[PDB]
Ligand binder design. Structure first.
Ligand SMILES: NC(=O)c1ccc[n+]([C@@H]2O[C@H](COP(=O)([O-])OP(=O)(O)OC[C@H]3O[C@@H](n4cnc5c(N)ncnc54)[C@H](O)[C@@H]3O)[C@@H](O)[C@H]2O)c1
Ligand SMILES: NC(=O)c1ccc[n+]([C@@H]2O[C@H](COP(=O)([O-])OP(=O)(O)OC[C@H]3O[C@@H](n4cnc5c(N)ncnc54)[C@H](O)[C@@H]3O)[C@@H](O)[C@H]2O)c1
Lengths: 340, 340
């Protein structure tokens, strides 16, 4: 069976408000999770709602942050006050847009935030507003540094978006080879995993998901370097938590997380020009789409293109959700008196 | 035998001036190439001097660009006028520093440049000046887009640096799995290469360097997405050449290259604070260095750390250079009357 995004979004918002979150926060979270599911990124979709609500219940998420903002020129610092990541991040997007419109560039350093879901959503929103956007967030350590055997950095994703005539280019990638969610999945299906995904407690690559102690960086040294880029911009520079100081959303419940985010919006109008940029992006997009395919492929796609086609189809015919996820959501709704 | 950096640098500058380059350009190129060799990045060191000079001889490189600069707020656009990449890039570094010091952020969009060598050198220079830095450059297409069988993008590297008490963090990476230089090397040694490096003319991975038609992106879709990030910032946004419009330094001699670069400097002082940033970077650096090593490793290193230790050793005991490279340099010096 398939579900309607409008129904799921309204339901999620209603549930969150019943749980104590203010309207802006409830709307922001419903948006982030449902929009991720629409694009096929379920790892950051509604399956996260249950834990998000548990964190709120435990008093680890601010239900109504005022979101203090301080700006000077093209720079702004945002205090998330431990509010829901999507709520904090959308305010940062608003600030980045305003700053870039006035200064050509707009950088927002966010601290004291929490898990904000799919980084690409924020980058895409800024791009649809006409900006070239860069969005990063750090996360609790799950990845060993290159050459190490103990966790040092989170999956720390980097997202980058830019508008084109044919669509919105959206690069959104974790800096680790894989993700714990995929490892746990393999554990259930009793399948082997590529040794490139993780290492055992000794620090040696393993093809057994049951033996994975930590994730490995994408392409060895490079993914490790990229994870540090994300950590520096997201946590060190912002005043937020850094690595082990961030807080594990699933494992540590003694204090709120202190996730950091970094957002940068650039106005093409102050560079090559708004319309010129659009045309140039169009030429590049066209050239890529015209590229003859490699074996096993029918055509080349731009990052974010398949995600957009998936969202379009999901809006047109409904969204597919794992039976397990639906069960959890239904149970969550029932205990709060918000019928699914 | 080993060579002295001071001798090589002075010699390179002298040769370039004899070839017609003005003093600033000669000094800039000598610096870029020798500093790359010192750090162990020979692929962008003196072995490049011969072709750089040939491009100059052919009138494809401006020997004395005036480097027109236009600024508005935290944004600057630089016209390299086809000058040597290192000369153009160092001017961009100067502009980025000035802008960031006054606005908190400084972005420079460079167009009509040429090959500028090691991207990390420019990022490192900005970091040693106290800034968090981002430096990118596009390059003539050598890499197929994910899912494609024809070249669409250059090795398009991304560099990122930030100061720490223990040293300068310098992330510097091509977005391709490997590089043509390594493929050609394998071709000579008649060795097999990892199929992850390149594809044949049909677009299928190959372990035979003799059959490599194009390079593959780092980690499939991710490296492709990163290469596009670099292309958008370096070429599309700046007004420089884009992909096939850049110009192949080794293969096309009908017109100067139009390489683009993007530089961003951020003042920690406008975010968490200069001294606070330094301390936080120090804590992160310390944590990484203290990470127990994985098998085959004795300790964990920060990106740029091994490069710094190599440069220190090279300054202390001299630089090692391939006999083939030395032969080429000697021949170059002889035809110009600048004895090696
Ligand atoms: N909030 C957090 O703490 C956190 C932490 C880690 C990851 N994440 C999110 O989890 C998600 C993880 O994504 P991922 O790293 O697995 O990325 P991925 O491997 O699925 O893809 C990376 C990039 O490749 C592009 N791509 C994939 N297949 C393609 C194809 N066939 N043709 C062209 N382009 C293609 C995508 O559009 C994307 O931009 C992201 O949305 C990330 O933001 C969030
Ligand atoms: N001018 C151009 O057009 C152009 C094009 C492509 C590449 N390049 C340059 O060529 C060079 C290519 O570099 P690369 O992609 O092969 O990078 P690489 O694989 O050698 O390393 C990538 C990153 O990994 C880090 N690293 C490597 N080994 C490590 C270890 N043991 N511990 C910790 N960190 C480690 C490095 O410090 C670096 O920041 C770069 O300097 C790049 O700027 C220039």
């Amino acid at each position: 069976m398939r579900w309607r995004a409008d129904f799921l979004s309204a339901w999620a918002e209603a549930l969150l408000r019943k749980a104590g979150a203010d309207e802006p926060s409830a709307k922001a979270v419903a948006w982030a999770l449902v929009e991720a599911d629409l694009r096929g990124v379920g790892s950051h979709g509604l399956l996260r709602l249950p834990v998000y609500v548990r964190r709120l219940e435990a008093g680890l998420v601010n239900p109504s942050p005022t979101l203090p903002l301080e700006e000077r020129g093209p720079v702004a610092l945002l205090d998330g006050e431990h509010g829901f990541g999507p709520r904090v991040a959308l305010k940062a997007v608003e600030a980045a847009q305003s700053l870039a419109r006035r200064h050509g560039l707009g950088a927002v350093g966010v601290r004291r935030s929490t898990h904000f879901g799919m980084a690409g959503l924020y980058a895409e929103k800024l791009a649809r507003e006409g900006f070239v956007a860069w969005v990063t967030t750090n996360a609790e350590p799950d990845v060993v540094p290159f050459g190490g055997r103990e966790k040092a950095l989170g999956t720390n994703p980097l997202a980058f978006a830019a508008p084109a005539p044919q669509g919105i280019l959206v690069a959104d990638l974790a800096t680790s080879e894989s993700a714990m969610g995929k490892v746990f999945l393999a554990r259930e299906k009793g399948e082997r995993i590529p040794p490139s995904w993780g290492v055992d407690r000794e620090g040696s690559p393993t093809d057994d998901p049951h033996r994975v102690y930590a994730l490995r960086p994408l392409g060895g040294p490079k993914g490790y370097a990229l994870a540090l880029l994300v950590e520096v911009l997201s946590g060190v520079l912002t005043g937020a938590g850094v690595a082990h100081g961030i807080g594990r959303m699933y494992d540590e419940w003694d204090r709120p997380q202190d996730v950091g985010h970094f957002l940068l919006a650039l106005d093409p109008g102050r560079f090559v020009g708004k319309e010129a940029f659009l045309e140039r992006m169009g030429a590049l997009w066209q050239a890529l789409k015209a590229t003859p395919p490699a074996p096993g492929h029918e055509e080349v796609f731009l990052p974010g293109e398949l995600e957009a086609r998936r969202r379009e189809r999901a809006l047109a015919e409904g969204m597919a959700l794992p039976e397990r996820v639906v069960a959890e959501l239904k149970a969550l709704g029932e205990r709060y008196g918000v019928p699914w």
